[PDB]
Every structure is written in C-alpha cells, then in structure tokens.
C-alpha cells in the first residue's frame, strides 16, 4: 500500500509529504518529500543587505526566534 | 453482602413459586372442564360438517 | 401472518441473491438473509436462545470474514439497478397480498411455541431456556461439547497451518 | 469614513436589532423567507469548523486561538482534520509552487459553502517572499478568499477579528431572499 | 465562607446592579459574562469603560458598547 | 400434502443455492457465499426437524460449530492462493 | 418479538426520512471533477493482510467457544452439580492452557 | 466559572428521566394501573391471559363482589 | 390481546428515542463544555445564551451543507452506513431496564452483544464505500479493535450474568438492593471502562478514528448529514455505555433521579478520560485485548464458577 | 534509592539512569500501580483538579489582552 502523509495531515507539520509504502500496519518504506515550504531564502538574502536579511532568520526556524537572530 | 442479598432474592422467588403452586390446581381444573367441553363441541362440529 | 412476511422476504432476498454477481453485494444479501432466518426460526421455538446463538455465531462472528474478504476482493462499487429493485418490490407486494388472500391458520407451522403448549404442562413453567440446553451439560452428552471446544482449538491449529502465516 | 456617532446623536438613534434585513418586510412570504434565512445564517455562523491547514509560522498563532487565553471554541470554531467535515480553510502560511495543487485539491474536495481566510502576508499578496522563484504571489490567484487577516504573524485578537468578520459576513448572507427575487 | 454561600448574594447584587432581572437577562445575553466594576470612563460615542482589580490580568478592564447598536 | 405445505420452501431455496453453488456464470467467492446460504437453509430445515421433539434443540449449535468451521476452512483455503495465484484468482469462472 | 419488528422498522423509516429530508435540505451546487475525488491528504492518489485475517479467525473461534459458555448459568440449578463443575473447570482450564501455549509459542 | 457545566449536564438528567416518569403518569391514565404486567415467566402470561379472558381490560379487578351469594 | 399494551409500548419507545436524541445533542454540548474545562480554557459560549443552542447550531449547519460523495457515479452504498449506525444506536436502547414494562427482554445481554456485533458491520460498510485508502485503513482498524474486545466484552458480561443467575436485566436490581456491584467488581469496573471505551471509539482507543495517525478513520469522506447521523450514533453509544455501567455496577435504581444523576456522572467520566489519556498502538492493543483482558476474563469467570458453586451448597 | 547504571559526572544530569528495583516491596508497589491504575488515578486527579481552576479565557472583544507601547501594527503617517 503506497500512501501519502501529505501536507493536510496533522501529524505532519503541514507541508511534509511522506510517501510511505505499507505492508499492513508496518512501514516497509518511507520517503519524505520536502520543499513544499521552500521559499527561496538564500536567493533572496543576496539581493538585500545584512540588516534586511536579519528578519529571514526569524522566519527560518520559527519556534527558535532569538536563537536564530543570535546565530546570525 | 452478596450472599445475604442472594439469600433474600432466593426466599422471595421461593415465596412466589409457592404462591404459584397454590394458584395452579384450580386453574388446572378450570382448564380441564373447558377442554372437555371444547372437545365435545369440536366433535359435534366435525360430525355436522362432514355429513 | 408475519411468518408469511418472513417467507416472502426470504424468497425475495434469495432470488436477488441468485441474480446479483458482485461479491460484497452477495455478502450484504447474506447478512440481511441471516436476520430473517433468525426471526423465522424464532417463530417455531419456545424461546429465542438459538436465534441469538445463530446470530452471534453466523452474522456477527463468521460473516465478517466474508465481508472483509469480499470488500478487499472488489475495487468497484455497486451498480444499483432500479429494474431489479422494482421487480423485487413488485414480487414482494404480490406475495404479501397473496398472504392476505390466504388462510393463515392452515399456513401456520405445526411446531409448538411456549404458549401453544398445554396449560397443564409442568415443564413449560419452570425456567425459560432451561430444559432444552440441559443436555449440553449433563451425562453422557457433555463429551460432545468438550469435543466441540477441542474441535475449535484444533480448527485454529489447522487454519494457522494452511494459511502459512 | 464616517464619524462614529456622538452619544447625544446616538441616544436618538433606535436599536439596530439582530437581523441585518430588518423586520419591515412587506409580504408575509418575503418576511418568512427573511426569518428562515436569519435562522439559517445563525446556524451557519453559530458553528464554523475551520480546517487544520497550517503551512508556515502563521499557524503558530493559529494554535494560539486554540490556546486557553483566546479560546476559539466558544465562537463555534473548532478544528477538523478532514476537509469534508470543515467549513473554513484558513490559509496560514506560505503557499509555494509545489503547494499549489495540494491547496487547490483540498479546497475543491471541501463542500460548499466555502469561506476562505487568508492569514498573513505570505497568504495574501506574497509578502516577504513576493519576489521569490518558488512562491505564489498570494493565494488569491488560486483559492477565492473572503477574509484577509493583515499582520505578518497576525496577533491572535486580529485573527479572531477576522473570524468575527467572517461571522458578520455569514450573518449577512442572503440566499432565500435572492431565491424569491430570482 | 468555606462553602461559598456568600457568592450567591454577590450574584443577587449583580442582578440588582444590572437594573433588575430583565436587564440582567439582556446583559447576560449580550455581554458573555456578568461582572461588577467601578465605572471609569464614558466616551463621546457612548461606550462605558469599567475597571475592577478583583479579576485576573486581561479581564479586569472591560468595555460595554453604546446601547444604540 | 404435508411436504407441499410445510418445509417445502427450504427445499426449493436449498436447490436454488445448490444451483448457484455449481453454476459456471459465478466465481469462487460466489460459490462460498451460496454455500453459506445453503448452510442457513440447512439450519432452517434442521430446526424445523428438531422442534418436533421438545427438548433436543441443543443440537443446533453443534451443526453451527461444524459448518462455521467449514466456512472458515473454505475462506482460509481461498485466501491461501493470494501469495501464489495473485489477487485475480477471485474472478476465476472455472477450476 | 412482533413489537420489536414494528419498532425497528419505524426506526429505519424515521432515519431514512430524516436523511431524505437532509438530502433535500442540503445545498445543491455544481458537481465537480475534483470534488468527487477520494480524499488523500493533499496530492491525489491495499493488499490482503494475513495477520488481520487470523485475528478475525481467532475472534471467530473464541466467539463460537463463548457460545458454549453462554448456556451454563441457567443449567446450574437444573443439572448434576459434579458433571457441571467438571465440564466448566475443564472447559475454562483447557481454554487457559491453549491461550498460554499459543502465547509461549 | 466552573458552574457553567451544570447548564449542560442537569438537562441531560431531566430528559432521560422523561421516558419512565411520563409513562408512570401515562399508565395511570389509560390503564389505571401504573405498571404493565410482566411477561417473563410463563405463569404470569397464563394468568394475564386468564384476566383478559375474564374481563376485556386485564388490569380491571374482579374482586369479591363478583362471587354470588350462596 | 389488549391493544393499550401495543399503544403504550409504541409511545414509550418513541419517547425514549426522542429523549435519547436530545440527550445526545446535550451530551455533545456537555463534552465540548467540560472537555474545555479539562484544560484551562472555557467551553462553548456566545451562541444564544451561554452556549446552550450550540448543538442546534451544529444541526442547522450539518443539515444544510453540500452532501459530497467519494465518487460521482454510484454512491448508494455511501448512504447505508449512517442509516444503520443511527438505527443500531437507537435500537440498542430497547434492552434498557424499564420497571414499568416496555419490552420484556428476558435475554437482554444477548441483544446488546448482537447490536455490538453489528457495530463492526456498520463501520465496515463505512470504511469500504468511502473509496479512500485512509477510509479502508480506519475501517479495518475499527473492525480489528471492536472484534478484539467483542470476545472480551462477551466474557466480562458472561461473568456478570453468573452473579444474577439469569439474563434478565431487571435481575440486576434485586441483587443490588443492599449494596452496589462497584464494591465487589472494582477491577471489573476498570476493565469494563476499558471495554466501553473500545467498542465506542473514544480517546483511549482512538487509533481507529483519530485525528493524528489518520486524518479520520471512517468519517473522512462523511459530511453534511451523514457525519451528523454518525456523530449522533456514536454519542448514543456513549450514552448506552454510561447507562450499562450504571445498571451493572451502580445499583439499577431505574426510578430514582440519582440513577440519572449517576448516568450523567458516568458520561462525565467518559469525557474525563477523553481529555486525559493518550492513545494505544495496534500491537499493544492486540496485546491488551487477547492476553491481559482475556486471561483476566477466564480467571475471574473461574472465580465466579467456584463462588456460585460454593453459595449453591450453602443456600 | 536505586543505583546508577552510568556514573553521573559533575556538569551533567542523567535521565532514565536508575536501576530497576528488585526488592519485593518495590515490585509489589509497581505491580499494584500496574494492576489498579494508580498512576492513571493520579493523572485523573490532576486532570479533575483543573476543572476547579480559573479559566484564562479573556472574552474577546469586550475584554482585550495585554499589549505594549512598542507594539507593531498598522503603519501610519504622522
Ligand atoms: C416561519 C417563521 C419564522 C421561522 C424562523 C425564525 C427565526 C428566529 C431566529 C432569528 O434569527 O430571529 C431573528 C429575528 C429578528 O430579530 P430582531 O427584531 O432583529 O431583534 C429583536 C431585538 O431588536 C433584539 O433582541 P433582544 O435584545 O430583544 O433579545 C432577544 C431575546 C433574547 O434572546 C433570546 O432569547 C435568544 C435565545 C436564547 C435561548 C437560550 C436557551 C436555549 C435552550 C435550548 C434548548 O429577547 C426576548 O426574548 C425578550 C426578553 C425575554 C426575557 C426572558 C427572561 C427569563 C428569566 O427575530 C424575530 O423576528 C423575533 C420574533 C420571532 C422569533 C420567535 C418568537 C416566538 C417563539 C419564542 C420562544 C418560545 C419558546
Ligand atoms: C405519476 C407517474 C410519474 C412518472 C413516474 C416515472 C417512473 C419511471 C421513470 C423513473 C425511473 O425509474 O428512472 C430510472 C432511473 C435509472 O436508475 P438506475 O440507473 O436503474 O439505477 C439508479 C442509479 O444506480 C443511481 O445512481 P446514483 O448513485 O447516481 O444515484 C443517486 C441517488 C441520490 O440519492 C439521493 O439523493 C437520496 C438521498 C437519501 C435517501 C435515503 C437513503 C436511500 O439517487 C437515488 O438513489 C434515487 C432514488 O432511476 C431513477 O430515476 C431513480 C429515481 C426514481
Ligand atoms: C431491495 C434492494 C435490492 C437492490 C439490488 O438488488 O440491487 C442490485 C445490485 C446488483 O449488483 P451487481 O453489480 O451484482 O449487479 C448484477 C445484477 N444485475 C445486473 C442483474 C443488476 O445489488 C446491489 O447493489 C446490492 C445492494 C445491497 C443489497 C442488500
Ligand atoms: C438490521 C438488524 C440489526 C440487528 C438486530 C439484532 C437483534 C437481535 C437478534 C435477534 O434475533 O433478536 C431477537 C429479537 C427478539 O428478542 P426476544 O425474543 O429475546 O425478546 C422477547 C420479545 N419482547 C421483548 C417483545 C418480549 O428480535 C429482534 O430483535 C427483531 C429484529 C428486527 C429487525 C428488523 C430489520 C431487519
Ligand atoms: C421554528 C423555530 C424557529 C426558532 C428557532 C430558534 C432560534 C433561536 C435563535 O436563533 O436564538 C439566537 C438569537 C440570538 O443569539 P445569537 O447566537 O445570534 O447571539 C448571541 C448573542 N451574543 C453574540 C451577544 C452573545 O436570537 C434571536 O435572534 C431572537 C430569538 C427569539 C426567540 C427564538 C426562539 C428561541 C427558543
Ligand atoms: C435538527 C435538524 C434540523 C434540520 C434543519 C435545520 C435548518 C432549518 C431552518 C433553515 C431551513 C433552510 C432551508 C433552505 C436550505 C437550502 C438553502 C439554499 O441554498 O436554498 C437554495 C434553493 C434554490 O435557490 P437558488 O435559485 O439560489 O438555487 C440554485 C442553485 N445555486 C445555489 C447553485 C445557485 O432555495 C430553495 O429551494 C427555496 C426553499 C424555500 C423553502 C425552504 C424550506 C422551508 C421549510 C423548512
Ligand atoms: S505572513 Fe509572516 S508570520 Fe505568516 S507565514 Fe509569512 S512570514 Fe510567517
């Protein structure tokens, strides 16, 4: 059974697409498909200055805000 | 406590069964008289129908 | 009267069981036949124990295997036809009005119920579903139900071997 | 705009009432259809079930109306995971190019009436990735949107203000009056 | 009190301070909770701002809007 | 007569289920479901027999146990060909 | 039992009438290609499992076994006590030994 | 505060108390006897049959006034 | 045969059905309210007055939305699952112990086991006809857990029938005239709570119909009236399990208002375990249903076989 | 007090490092907690104690939550 834990699914974080092959309840294979929330951050940093690219890191890992700003 | 409750339920159903055994033979005699009478009318009806 | 209604319903479900071919639809026809068979065997008997036993064993216990296998066997849905529904309804109304125009005393079954027995019958007043089930748990017929439980365990041993797990 | 009415002026104003249509309908059939539409809109605004569609950071505020301080459950609002059982889809996050057919299919499998709330600057207008190669310039090009909540992470009072504005839109829905005038 | 009987007369004086039982009914129907508080402000638009530090933070200040709407 | 008016219908439906069991227009799952249809009709006729006697109805769960073990045996025979004959063997019209 | 048929047919008739009136009261919109599609999360799209089938078979064997444990509450006041106790203790003990043996193997 | 649950629960206590209590009124209205006759044992069914044979209402009493003077 | 028996049986059954349905609506209100109070948050409010007509807001909305279908051509098999689900949930209530006679069910436990054995059938037609792999997985998982605790439930109720000596539900009243069965059967009380949260899909046994591992097990394609009938059927099953806990363990007390207060309290307990416990797994639930509960069932059935033999000599 | 499987250093803290106890008192305590749902009873009691707590629902829009003077909202031209 091929199955999609797609972006609608709540155990996924809203953009994960887990294409998983199932023999019964067991998971024989699980390929994560990502890039559904790819926003082209590294292409957009180079067209802006340092203080303009500082708010990108707040939106990168968005449960760790001040740590990302601290790292940048 | 369940043993005492089951003893109470047992004596209640034994009281009901003894009352049933009292009521029973009068109703048996009444059924006997009606059964013999109905057998007589059934034999008479079968005799007059099959002439 | 209601015995003739169950006769008509069993006839109608049997002829549509003969007509249809989709395997889950035959499974649905079996599960709705089992209810009418349970009720109709309940009309002849003193009490409804064996209808309940047939119900738990056959419908809720065994036919769920058939429903699961026939559900995973067929990918497609039912193709409902209004012609077969109309023919089943027409033969059902015809058989109910045929039971209306027929004497129900001659068509009733000769098997005695709990109230069709004599009033002076001592055995009927004792306890509901007591004397019929008595021979299951008395000498010398208890060896058959011990052999039946052993037979069910041996059946499970057979089934594990033949499916190969 | 209009100046909000001064209390000297507003004391002379009568009460608005619950019904936006008013009870001054002429025909008895038109009045009956107006009250039936009022009851239908009250039932629809009394419980809207939004869908668990959280794409990006905005959704971290979306759970913050689930949170005990703001408490969306006393507004008829409770999350449903399946798109069939849900009324509303809240686009809360960044719709990308790989995300577009998934959002369109999830919206199309939702049953009508379908109100859509765009939560956040990535949901409406593209926002902070508006000039990106793989970000759709707002979700208005794909899914038709009824309420647009403005803030980059909308505060949760502002998202719930969008929810109350959607409830006012649902209360203003005219279906049976339009059927009588069709 | 240990049991909480003295909150019933607080509910009763809430009813009397609302203006009766019908006015308390339409206050409970409109404002989702019944509260007492010191009247702090009245706008030119007719709103009424009440404050009472008995409640916890976030609930100690409330608006009651103008009664023409 | 007695056979025409009483217990005629289980015979007719038993022959109908037997003809559904052996017809070439059906498949193996239809054979098994028609087999349990004649199991139900056999229970009907056996209960009509067993209720002429008063207190011998306890045999009805013996035949039930044997025929239910037959049905589970037939299903476990039929699904044991899934890993060998594939999932398309349920549509086989011939053996 | 004849009243049970009447009340069950009335419950079935009331539920079908309520669902028919719900289908009338449901808002009829234009039917679509994607709206009729089966729901897979997001992007659009099982074999036979033997373990669940033997779960159903174990359920069936234990169900037919329970159908022989069912009568003996009534028979306890109307049978030989020694025979009834021997059959009940043997019945549940062989069931427990079989369950523990299938657990260990 | 926490007493707002009791609007949603006590009503549940009332409604499910309806289908017996109304019958405890209603059997006192059209029958006159508050309890319908129990049909579990066969002897109760036979004696109920005897009552419905004796009077057209089986819950109507045939007391000692039925007995003729002798 | 006297016709007022039929008339009053019909009136009492229809009144029972109506009151059960309105109690289902108010049970959904109670669950949304106190399930909020399980956490810090409030329950429903702001609709009508103090959130009371919120289930009527649910009922107006669910009976108006577009009845969508999992496929466009043939969908009559999609209809037959909520009809039979609500039919069984309103039909199982006929074996309630009524002291004023409504139906003389001398075998009520077998009737309850029959309706529970159809629960698997309505959820199996719920799973298959919805044409989705999530729907088939949820239907197979629900059929798996319900037939896994069907055997356990049959053995537990079969152990309880040994105490009263018959299958008549009103015989639970006469054996509870001095004390409740909660005192004597407290591990059976915990096991029966674990049983009653398994046949009806609640949070402790929610791998069948959860929102985490599946989006929805068998309500995934059901909406706009079918979901309303399924939801009402499941909450009627919750009400039936609360009543059946209150008859067996707590004294039947059918007339007293304290019985219905305890029924609302056991519904409160059902919503109390709704907010507390996490969800079991498939392997751990096969371990629970077939080894622990089965071994406890057979062992304590042996205990009551010995106890009912010991009291039979003494009485 | 169970013994340590791994010796805990000065700058670190170890979780699930306790040995499983083998004396009969601790085995009977763990057995009674397994059989009679003691830890589930503690979880149920902790859950039920939060019904009696004050709700934190701030009743929007009659009462609005705290803000700050630095708060960023609608841009405006002074
Ligand atoms: C075909 C026929 C029509 C079918 C469709 C009808 C739709 C009705 C709903 C709707 O949308 O109406 C809007 C529509 C428009 O209203 P409006 O004129 O714009 O607003 C009225 C005021 O200006 C603004 O309202 P208000 O501020 O005056 O408050 C409204 C209401 C108070 O509000 C409510 O009562 C709301 C409902 C709360 C229910 C709480 C319990 C729920 C229990 C469920 C179980 O006030 C009263 O009822 C008067 C005071 C009562 C004091 C009671 C004290 C008890 C102690 O309402 C009406 O037309 C009202 C009349 C028709 C409604 C039915 C009246 C007869 C039945 C009464 C109940 C009998 C039991
Ligand atoms: C005075 C005389 C006036 C004239 C009378 C004329 C009578 C003959 C002509 C009508 C007729 O029989 O047309 C055959 C025409 C052809 O049907 P079919 O292809 O033989 O089979 C029906 C399809 O499988 C059905 O395929 P489907 O899945 O698309 O069906 C949609 C479903 C939609 O069902 C609903 O909307 C019913 C809602 C739930 C109801 C309660 C549960 C059932 O409609 C029905 O179930 C119809 C009832 O059937 C109908 O028009 C059915 C309604 C009559
Ligand atoms: C009474 C309802 C009868 C419905 C019926 O027979 O439908 C025909 C269909 C037949 O399905 P089918 O796909 O096997 O059709 C083959 C039979 N012909 C071509 C003659 C129609 O049965 C069902 O849809 C079963 C529904 C459930 C029945 C219980
Ligand atoms: C669709 C059927 C859903 C499942 C119904 C299961 C009912 C229990 C099985 C059974 O045989 O019950 C006998 C019972 C009779 O139980 P009984 O005979 O033990 O009770 C005595 C009867 N009273 C209570 C009136 C004194 O019959 C039924 O439940 C009739 C079911 C009718 C179904 C109609 C739709 C088909
Ligand atoms: C045929 C029956 C027609 C009436 C059905 C009941 C409608 C009740 C209703 O909508 O009340 C809520 C609405 C108002 O409630 P609401 O849900 O619109 O707003 C609640 C108020 N706030 C948001 C401030 C907390 O009532 C009315 O509009 C007037 C109702 C008059 C009485 C109607 C019958 C009540 C029983
Ligand atoms: C406890 C269960 C309660 C169940 C019922 C709950 C709600 C009851 C109160 C509200 C009734 C609403 C009735 C209408 C529902 C459908 C609304 C709709 O879109 O109608 C459009 C239809 C057609 O209007 P139309 O022309 O716009 O439709 C064309 C199709 N679309 C929508 C795509 C443009 O309106 C009607 O058919 C008018 C019906 C008038 C009578 C209403 C019922 C009265 C009795 C109740
Ligand atoms: S609008 Fe702002 S907060 Fe929302 S997803 Fe985009 S960057 Fe994040």
Residue numbers in the entry:
A (entry chain S2): 85 to 156
B (entry chain AO): 53 to 103
C (entry chain 6): 1 to 165
D (entry chain S7): 40 to 221
E (entry chain AN): 3 to 71
F (entry chain 4L): 1 to 95
G (entry chain 3): 1 to 45, 51 to 110
H (entry chain A1): 1 to 70
Publication excerpt:
Respiratory complex I is a proton-pumping oxidoreductase key to bioenergetic metabolism. CI couples the transfer of electrons from NADH to CoQ to the pumping of four H+ across the IMM. It has an ‘L’ shaped structure consisting of two arms: a peripheral arm (PA) that extends into the matrix and a membrane arm (MA) that is embedded in the IMM. Our Dm-CI structure contained the 14 core subunits as well as 29 accessory subunits, for a total composition of 43 subunits, two fewer than the 45 total subunits observed in mammals.
Initial poor resolvability of the average Dm-CI map around NDUFA10 at the interface of the PA and MA led us to perform focused classifications using a mask encompassing subunits NDUFA10, NDUFA5, NDUFA6, and NDUFAB1-α. This classification revealed two major classes and two minor classes of Dm-CI particles that differ in the presence of an ordered α-helical element from NDUFS4 bound at the interface of NDUFA5, NDUFA10, and NDUFA6 and in the angle between the PA and MA. We name the states the NDUFS4-helix-locked (helix-locked) state and the flexible class 1-3 states. Overall, the helix-locked state and the flexible class 1 state mainly differ from each other by a rotation of the PA and the tilting of subunit ND1. According to this measure, the helix-locked state is most like the closed/active states and the Dm-CI flexible class 1 state is most like the open/deactive states of mammalian CI. Although the density of the NDUFAB1-α subunit is weak due to flexibility, its position in flexible class 1 is consistent with the formation of salt-bridges between residues D146AB1-α, D149AB1-α and R209A10. In the flexible class 1 state, the N-terminus of NDUFS4 is disordered, and NDUFA5 slides along the surface of NDUFA10 such that R92A5 forms a salt bridge with E302A10. The TMH1-2ND3 loop is well ordered in the helix-locked state and partially disordered, though to a lesser extent than seen in most CI open states, in the flexible class 1 state; and TMH3ND6 is α-helical in the helix-locked state and contains a π-bulge in the flexible class 1 state. In the flexible class 1 state, the C-terminal loop of NDUFA9 moves away from the TMH1-2ND3 loop, providing space for conformational flexibility and both loops become partially disordered. Second, in the flexible class 1 state in which the PA and MA twist to bring NDUFAB1-α and NDUFA10 into close proximity, we see increased flexibility in the TMH1-2ND3 loop, and the formation of the TMH3ND6 π-bulge is more consistent with the open/deactive state of CI. However, it is important to note that the range of disordered residues in the TMH1-2ND3 loop is distinct and shorter than that seen in other open/deactive states and the conserved Cys41ND3 remains well-ordered and hydrogen-bonded to Tyr134ND1.
